[PDB]
Design an enzyme around this catalytic site. Sequence first.
Site, PDB file in Angstrom:
ATOM      1  N   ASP J 205     -10.916-112.414  12.564  1.00  0.00           N
ATOM      2  CA  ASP J 205     -12.146-112.461  11.732  1.00  0.00           C
ATOM      3  C   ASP J 205     -13.424-112.061  12.969  1.00  0.00           C
ATOM      4  O   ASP J 205     -14.284-112.827  12.803  1.00  0.00           O
ATOM      5  CB  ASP J 205     -12.468-113.638  11.353  1.00  0.00           C
ATOM      6  N   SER J 206     -13.145-111.421  14.010  1.00  0.00           N
ATOM      7  CA  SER J 206     -13.867-110.757  14.694  1.00  0.00           C
ATOM      8  C   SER J 206     -14.621-109.438  14.277  1.00  0.00           C
ATOM      9  O   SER J 206     -14.101-108.730  13.185  1.00  0.00           O
ATOM     10  CB  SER J 206     -13.733-110.656  16.034  1.00  0.00           C
TER      11      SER J 206
END
Lengths: 240, 65, 77, 254, 35, 115, 98, 192, 98, 526, 44
Positions: J205-206
């Site tokens: 989730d970057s």
Amino acid sequence: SLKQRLKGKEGRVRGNLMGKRVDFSARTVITPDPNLSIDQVGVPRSIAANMTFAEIVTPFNIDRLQELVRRGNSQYPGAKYIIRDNGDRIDLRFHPKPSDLHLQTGYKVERHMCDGDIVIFNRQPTLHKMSMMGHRVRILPWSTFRLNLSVTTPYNADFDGDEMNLHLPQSLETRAEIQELAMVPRMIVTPQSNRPVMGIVQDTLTAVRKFTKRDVFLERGEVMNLLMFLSTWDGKVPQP
Amino acid sequence: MIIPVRCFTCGKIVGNKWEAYLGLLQAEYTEGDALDALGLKRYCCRRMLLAHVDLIEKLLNYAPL
Amino acid sequence: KRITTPYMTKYERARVLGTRALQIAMCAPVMVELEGETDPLLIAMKELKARKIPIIIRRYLPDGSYEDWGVDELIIS
Amino acid sequence: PYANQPTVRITELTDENVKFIIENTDLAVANSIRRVFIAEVPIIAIDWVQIDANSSVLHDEFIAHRLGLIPLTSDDIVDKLQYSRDCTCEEFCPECSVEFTLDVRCNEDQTRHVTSRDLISNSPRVIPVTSDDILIVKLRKGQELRLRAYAKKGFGKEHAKWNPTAGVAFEYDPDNALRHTVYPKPEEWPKSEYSELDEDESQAPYDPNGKPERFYYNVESCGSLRPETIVLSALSGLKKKLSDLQTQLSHEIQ
Amino acid sequence: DEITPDLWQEACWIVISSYFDEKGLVRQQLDSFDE
Amino acid sequence: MNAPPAFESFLLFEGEKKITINKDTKVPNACLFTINKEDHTLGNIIKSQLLKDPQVLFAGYKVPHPLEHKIIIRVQTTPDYSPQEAFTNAITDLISELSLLEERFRVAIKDKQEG
Amino acid sequence: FIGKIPIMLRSTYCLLNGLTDRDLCELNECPLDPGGYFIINGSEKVLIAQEKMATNTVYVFAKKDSKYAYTGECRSCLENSSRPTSTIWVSMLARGGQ
Amino acid sequence: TVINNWLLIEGHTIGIGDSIADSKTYQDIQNTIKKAKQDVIEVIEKAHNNELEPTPGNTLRQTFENQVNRILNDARDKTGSSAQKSLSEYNNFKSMVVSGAKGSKINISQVIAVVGQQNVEGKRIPFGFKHRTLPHFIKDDYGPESRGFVENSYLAGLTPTEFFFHAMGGREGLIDTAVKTAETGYIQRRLI
Amino acid sequence: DGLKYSLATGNWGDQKKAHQARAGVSQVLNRLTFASTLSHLRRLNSPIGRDGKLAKPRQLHNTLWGMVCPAETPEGHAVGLVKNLALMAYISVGSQPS
Amino acid sequence: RKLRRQMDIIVSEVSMIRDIREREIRIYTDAGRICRPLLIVEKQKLLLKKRHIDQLKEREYNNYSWQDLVASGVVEYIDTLEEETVMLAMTPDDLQEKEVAYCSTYTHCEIHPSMILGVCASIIPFPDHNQSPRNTYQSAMGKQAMGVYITNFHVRMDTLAHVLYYPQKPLVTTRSMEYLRFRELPAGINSIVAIASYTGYNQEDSVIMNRSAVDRGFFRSVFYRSYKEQESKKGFDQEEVFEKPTRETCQGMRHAIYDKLDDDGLIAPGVRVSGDDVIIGKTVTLPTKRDCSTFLRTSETGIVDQVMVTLNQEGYKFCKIRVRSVRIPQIGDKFASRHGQKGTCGIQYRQEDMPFTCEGITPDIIINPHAIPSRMTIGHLIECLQGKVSANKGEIGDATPFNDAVNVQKISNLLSDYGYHLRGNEVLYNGFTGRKITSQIFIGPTYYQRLKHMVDDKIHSRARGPIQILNRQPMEGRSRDGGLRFGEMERDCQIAHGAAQFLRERLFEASDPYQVHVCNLCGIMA
Amino acid sequence: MIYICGECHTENEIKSRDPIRCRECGYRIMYKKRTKRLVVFDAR
RNA sequence: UUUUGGCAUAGUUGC
Ligand SMILES: [Mg+2]
Ligand SMILES: [Zn+2]
Ligand SMILES: [Zn+2]
Ligand SMILES: [Zn+2]
Ligand SMILES: [Zn+2]
């Protein structure tokens, strides 16, 4: 009342003896970095320039620490304080007096946290041993901590806004203790369920599942490019 | 706020096309026809004018100092 | 008449290395030949492999007695 | 053990873009040329702004940032300029920078558009490209914007305002004869504009001995440089980088 | 006369637009304070 | 605030070598060229040129970190041909190629402009 | 005079009531600002609506944690007067009593 | 490092096409849902006519609820199996599930075929209204959609009633997450 | 001063009776986006109370169809207790039954 | 009901419930009841005919408003207690058409089902294609996005404000957004996002970002801080006054330079400042005179935008100083779709390094594929596809939740008409090597929001700082400084490690080392 | 020092001793004039 | 010539 001063989470006992604010600690958000070994941690230059470690002046490091002193605290890597043997403290933000920049053996120099320094690294809530582990500092030029992806599982971390804490051990005894007990490689296998806690995750796991399929074939240029990234390679290209 | 000078993606000049775009909309163009008339092929550039909100017009209603 | 394990424990290794690195940092005489070594911890680990650290570990049994082990006597695991 | 013999065929040339084809070349060289187009062709762009007076609704950094993205005609003058930090002048001179002055006072009961036309240079060869015009800001009655600026030589690697291109289309093997990409259902995919396949075909037959060649380029200029000039300066700059690396390597070996 | 199904999609959103032109979004607060 | 100045990706600060050569002891006739303030622009093209040399047994490059502007090029040649010589020959071939391409591109522009 | 009542913005006693958008811009007030809030010492304060049980209604529950099989309560409250509301339970004792 | 650099050549993605199934698969799923709903109707009308007899150890309501629950679970598993069989080897959703990197088979079935039954406190959606789950149903309606069985996939989009019932279902998971955070380490901090 | 204090602090009841005063009724209006301001102005609060001990108010109830947003609740320790009105929802202002 | 529909003696908001089985008619008129308007159905037909729609189309210059619909007895307010006694049609076009009879006694009909949602849930495109916790999470995040919170923000002086440079209305929108003024005050940018694994900095989730896009002002913003300060004169014992103080007239001052201030104790708007600089030089008389000037937040830095001076309610001169700081996106800053796809900037790559299509379209943002499968935010993918279709068509796409006229197959056919792959995938080329990527990347425009949680407001470090006055431990000063609590869980962790020396170091000599004298005979301190 | 009235834009001089008020409107909000120190931005 | 500081209530928000 004196009862309420001690009672509860915020009393002296549970609020100020079983846990308390500590110096030489930093916090910031975490972002991924697959280019770091699992035992390394990226650190911003500001935190490294702000936090310090006491190097004891020794003739093996007299010249290096003299250079760090002449750089002062203004510039990174540098030093903040000189603790002479008398206990008096010389603050290297305010003293261009060269006489006070002399270093006799046995003095301490609070140098800025440089590369390779050991740091305990933590994410709250702390639920098991692998939620606090020792990393090697690597200075990187932005305002986030960086982690290898594999260590996100023991910390239960993800780069969705999560913050992490960094404590710097301040003497060689505690530093050796962390280096020999709580470093990330020593924390691979947990005693909880006698199994590894770090594994291959996300992109690398999907990509290795694709990679070790029977019908993956690589031209020689691709092979050489990949073997560049293999640290343990013996330099011998295998037979195709 | 005001039209960006460059398309964020491809860096094409799009700041000199807002007024013309509005003029073409007063000529009863469909918005696709207006963007084609201004020579915006990549949807990265078309996104700029098609989704821009010219809030500066609302800000010029208030007195200067 | 010793009953404790002949193997140096992990905690014994940790404290011995930290203490000896502190001593070497304080200009203590070094009990092994070193080359290009400046960090006290590397010199301490070299002494540990060499089994030349001059420390005796006092292990307290849970009855108020103790056993004294020369570090060279213990097995460096 | 030696260079290819690359060949060029220009398929289209306008004032906005040049479309051409490079054959007999490695993929790495073609991609490096495509990359130098974006990041390493030096142009002139505003990079120093002193705001003497701003009363617009936009704060000062907004106006400066918008001014930086104004593209400037830097066709031939950029070659004879020097980088400011390399120049020995006292911070600015006509050999490392081009001065601009803007002074617009909206003293009327209509919204005054401060466009690129109001930017006035001290050198006639370096003007805003549109000199319809790029809007810098809009002013109400009684609002003044008065500033000076300097535009200097730089390339897109430092900051995107020195990027001369407005999108570099790059392609090779349009029919996928090499299978560098694997379509799960090749029927669904529209033909490239450079495809030579009839519509009953969806994919060229696999070529076990193929190698990427005949790279198709379409370099669109933002306007600071003619696309011909973009490509020529790109090749010259990449050759210069390689010759400088050759010089440093010869020094290191010796 | 009757709203046909094809025209219903336009019709309902016309009704909702008229609502929000009339009452607005913070009608609860303003009406309660007026009362 | 920790954002690096944008110019520290193509500029050498003082006391920095552009290119440095180190012998690789794992394998004979192997060298590592560490080039500072460069990226895939030069790494990929030099690697691809070196792969065309028959006397080059291995040629690869890496960027050790995208936020650090080093490229490391490993070159191993046959044991009659120094990796340094291969590297120089690759650069000279690339320069000759690009000069030829400049000439032909100028000719192509002139033909297209004339008609 | 007996005091000063805060005025919710754009209510029918706020000075911005029923003013054109040009007038609101003349007063440096955003015409899209919905109002619906107060200004206390310059701080914009909003009253959050508070839900509670309706009054004057018979509600028959079964207390699982008591000696009552069922309890019929009624929070009875006067007609906009005497905010202390008197609640009355009418509870049937559990048959498992002593 | 090695496999992240190979993945620049391979590449990995996920798109709409990895959530599309064959038209035959959609028809098979719709036939399965038609059948399952009709069997639920058969169970309902047998219960209404008193032709349903309770199982040993269960009242007639528990018997009926277990019957409809097992019918709908059978339908959900059959639809999920058919959806997973329609997946191509190039389907990136399957490529992620097979490696164990993310998701699982139930997520594929929910995205492609059927979201399935919503449950609050481990039962079907209760009659919050007077003998109704919502005011858009008749009273005493124990049909699947009436009681919170989502028959569409996330690709197909949920109907308004299905959307509200799915929100009701997800509210429970949020509440349990909050309760776990409340009990994060309390048991631990006493144990230590 | 009482109205100003109560709206300034959000404590409701007498100032001397702050122990029994319901708190957090009045909040500082949120100004990050227009949507944040609008959602704050249309906010409902469920106090814990004794009622909260009896029946679980956190979980979404069927009667919130069309009245309360089913998918807007603050995450954390206030899930399902703080709610937002549905778009067309309108609260009765009250009139006389005479 | 006849009277209430005629707006006779019974007003609209009065609710009437007939409990038939219990033989009760309950009429409620009090306040606090919550209701919503519903179209009235009679004999399986709406009372809303086309003539009402015609009068409403020309709502201007006719004065036929909503209140005339209510007065016509076509739409009426219904509360939950009365909803208990209502047989409601979800939509006229299907529910009350003839059929195998399900119900033939509908009393009302929903205006549109999408009006069940709130303000922040009504900005979600295709929320009926998501897992509902993701809709809840987006409802939380939309309040935290950056935008233009109000049109007159220039004259306001709020304690904190964030203003995005170039907001855009969403390319894929809902009809509900028309009435939230979201078209007029947007919060976010339509960004060309590709869902692809890449160099490895978007994992977990970057987000990888396009550096060159950021250089072109992409998601650039401003952060405003207003510092207020009021001098007060309490009788004559203390007299606080604005003036630039000097070392020779005050008995304690910081080394921070006071030359920024003009000679009234106030800095001018337009001066660059930093975290230690004084902004209001105020001094209080000594019963010489000690200063009580105010400084910036130690982490912050900016330009003084605006300096206003007034008299307070008392009548004392007091000023408010708004300081501007331009926030460029960087590694660590949060971004989110309108689907709960929260994520921090992992790394920023220049345009040449980003992957690119055959047209030179690099993505602005690259998000990981693995953010999708567990979350099941299919609305994100449908938004991206619809965004591509709408950007090519020169139209604003519609993404109301419950709309059968919109279907992913129709969007795919429309996209295929524009010479793109029908599922939005594209053949992307590796930015570094220029090679084609073996898989075809899903790419297209998507509305993203820059959340307020920038890293530069969350980074801090402590070493030998301002301890407490009672506890002699580190304390939270005018910043995030003051160390981090080495809580109980951390102590138990280090006990489990056996790192006793480190645990002592944290809990004793890194927080509050101290020593006392104790008598050996009596153990009390001496 | 010169201050600008917040309602009628009149630049008026005010000392550090007198209460602030517009000398031709009576208004009680004043804004400081922009600094005369040179301010320079790179256009990035 | 080298400083230092309110605190302890409530709210909101992040993981
Ligand atoms: Mg997280
Ligand atoms: Zn563009
Ligand atoms: Zn010069
Ligand atoms: Zn004693
Ligand atoms: Zn005035």
